[model samples]
Target: GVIDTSAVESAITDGQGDMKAIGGYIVGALVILAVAGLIYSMLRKA
Candidate 1:
């Protein structure tokens, strides 16, 4: 049985923006944390 469907596509279309935004937020927080950690290490060495 082959299941061809528009339902999956529409669901993805509705959710894609929110998923992308969530990924961006996660990545942004990681970047901020990484930069802060790096700065802390450098200052501690200084």
Candidate 2:
């Protein structure tokens, strides 16, 4: 039996750009959080 994968492929193609944008936002947020944490830790040591 063969499975039809066209719908899945189409959906992914349609949303690929949005997915990349969202992934970039998530990565940027994580980096910002890491920097904030590091700054807070340094302030605490003073």
Candidate 3:
């Protein structure tokens, strides 16, 4: 069987971009949670 590498590469690149965006969103959410936790801890100590 013959495969088209160019098409495969294009599809993979598109998926990579989408995955990167999704990962960025998840990381951003985690960062927000971390900041919130830090603020709560400081408030608790006050």
Candidate 4:
């Protein structure tokens, strides 16, 4: 039960790009929502 498998390596390599792109999209979405919330708050106070 100790064979070094290429399967795991291939799976990770294939998924790495997808995960990176998904992470970037999530980060950008959060940034936009945060900025919008701040602007709304400032406008309400002003």
Best by lDDT: 3
The better-scoring model by TM-score among 3 and 4 is: 3
lDDT of each: 0.90, 0.91, 0.92, 0.91
Task: Please give the range of 10 consecutive residues that has the lowest summed lDDT in model 2.
Answer: 9-18
TM-score of each: 0.68, 0.60, 0.82, 0.67
**lDDT for each residue of candidate 1 in 1-46, tens digit (9 for 90 to 100):** 8888979999898799899989799998999999999899999975
Better of 1 and 3 by lDDT: 3
Clashes of 1: 0
Poorly placed runs, candidate 4 (over 4 Å): 1-4
lDDT of 2 by residue, 1-46 (tens): 9999989988898699799999899998999999999899899885
Residues 1-46 of candidate 4 have per-residue lDDT tens digits of 6898879999998799899999899998999999999899999876
Q: Count of backbone clashes for each model?
A: 0, 0, 0, 0
Candidate 1 colliding pairs: none
Deviation from native of the Cα of residue 39 in model 1, angstroms: 0.8
- The C-alpha stretches of model 3 lying farther than 4 A from their native spots are none
Error of model 3, residue 42, in angstroms: 0.6
Higher-ranked by lDDT: 2 or 3: 3
lDDT of 3: 0.92
Scanning candidate 1 in windows of ten residues, the lowest lDDT window is 5-14
